[PDB]
């Protein structure tokens, strides 16, 4: 049913002529046993992906957020359970409505986070899909990519999730590696989309050289890595920098990533 | 044990714990350490991949809420990001869409959309106001072991008035700071097993088995008693199994109970509180 839901989600925004991006976020984990209480877990807070999903929404994009269950959730990740449990005080007794009050300084940007989210929900521009294991991820990724294929160039894939490279078909563990699990996979299902992959390597030289090869083989468009943020394509390389002036003003680097990618997307389209 | 790196500010954690416990002991209040969530272990230096013993922590968080409702002082040692008491009932998507907007912000929401939201905030706030709920986060096995010893030393002075409700899924394997595809993992030093009893010899110790398979839990249960010398072993089987050296109880969640909004943990707590009373 996710296949059906994602397809309607994308076709609808496609008909309004709105761009749509699949943001993957968080890490996948792989079971080691049958019952499965143990898992090899690719750590990732999901913060980058969540903040990016936020910046895409503000930039007008439709957003399909495929994310690791319990990893950072857009908007809410800025307000952990203990923060809002202690800040929100029941205002008074009501008419089907509950009333609360809180110190603005206790919940900074809370009202704006609520608005942005509710606006996206009312506009039907944000669909959230949870995955836990590599298998969940692979299945949901294909469904999302097939849902975005009809938008051709207007679809974007922002693959920030840390995808497991190894799986299991004194504790003894031996696993089988899967090379393709390093490649973006979405081009086989949505060959016309604007595809971006994230690499972990932090050496400029390695990243540029690795990305350039990966780009010629798999044919996606952009590779992003944190070195400053380095954005790499077959014929360019951009180093983004966060200005101390912007830092103090509370500007996150994901906003600039999304800004630079969105303009690249426009040219691609 | 020393072989594991100490969590950031461990000593401070030890002190905060010792004081929260002593303050409540002096009030004649029972204190329970609830462990919740799973631990994970690194396999290489500069860890970006871990072996993670999973547990959502939902039952541990729910148990903490019920213990608080029973007047216990609760020390919640839990896996960062696993279920948090009260909040776990209203995940991100739920409150982001139900809560809608002077120096003081005002909000409104259909009570229908956030059932029991108000009573949850009150229970939590009452606990914080009264100093009855201390929260300690852990992530790795190393964090857990160090913070658990601190918690044991913190509750020891309470004698039998202290309870340990050990619900966390603790890693069985690891990789030594020294001894660090096909990865081989060494067994977690058995000396760590009785860590709690060794620091709090007189406490009412209860281990909660996360498994729900009847056969598997029953045997795992009758073992934690003979060998580990815990007072009680509890597990969800639907019914709850509560085992002691001299008794085996099965508890059911009624039809009218599952209706009036009663959860099994509340029942587990009622049962454990009287056994504790008799133990004291």
Curated annotation (Swiss-Prot), chain A:
Molecular function via GO: ATP binding; identical protein binding; phosphopantothenate--cysteine ligase activity; protein homodimerization activity
Keywords for the protein's UniProt record, in alphabetical order: Acetylation, ATP-binding, Cardiomyopathy, Disease variant, Ligase, Nucleotide-binding
Domain of life, per lineage: Eukaryota
Pfam families named in the record: DFP (PF04127)
GO cellular component: cytoplasm; cytosol; nucleus
EC numbers: 6.3.2.51
Coiled-coil annotated residue ranges, if any: none
Biological processes annotated in GO: acetyl-CoA biosynthetic process; coenzyme A biosynthetic process; heart process
Pathway annotation: Cofactor biosynthesis; coenzyme A biosynthesis; CoA from (R)-pantothenate: step 2/5
Reaction it catalyzes: (R)-4'-phosphopantothenate + L-cysteine + ATP = N-[(R)-4-phosphopantothenoyl]-L-cysteine + AMP + diphosphate + H(+); (R)-4'-phosphopantothenate + L-cysteine + CTP = N-[(R)-4-phosphopantothenoyl]-L-cysteine + CMP + diphosphate + H(+)
Annotated InterPro entries: CoaB-like_sf (IPR035929), DNA/pantothenate-metab_flavo_C (IPR007085)
Record's subunit section: Homodimer.
Entries under PANTHER family matching the protein: CORNICHON-RELATED (PTHR12290)
Disorder noted: Cardiomyopathy, dilated, 2C: A form of dilated cardiomyopathy, a disorder characterized by ventricular dilation and impaired systolic function, resulting in congestive heart failure and arrhythmia. Patients are at risk of premature death. CMD2C is an autosomal recessive form with variable severity and age of onset ranging from 2 to 20 years. Death in infancy or early childhood may occur in severely affected children.
Family: Belongs to the PPC synthetase family.
The protein's role, per its UniProt record: Catalyzes the second step in the biosynthesis of coenzyme A from vitamin B5, where cysteine is conjugated to 4'-phosphopantothenate to form 4-phosphopantothenoylcysteine. Has a preference for ATP over CTP as a cosubstrate.
Protein name: Phosphopantothenate--cysteine ligase
Organism field: Homo sapiens (Human)
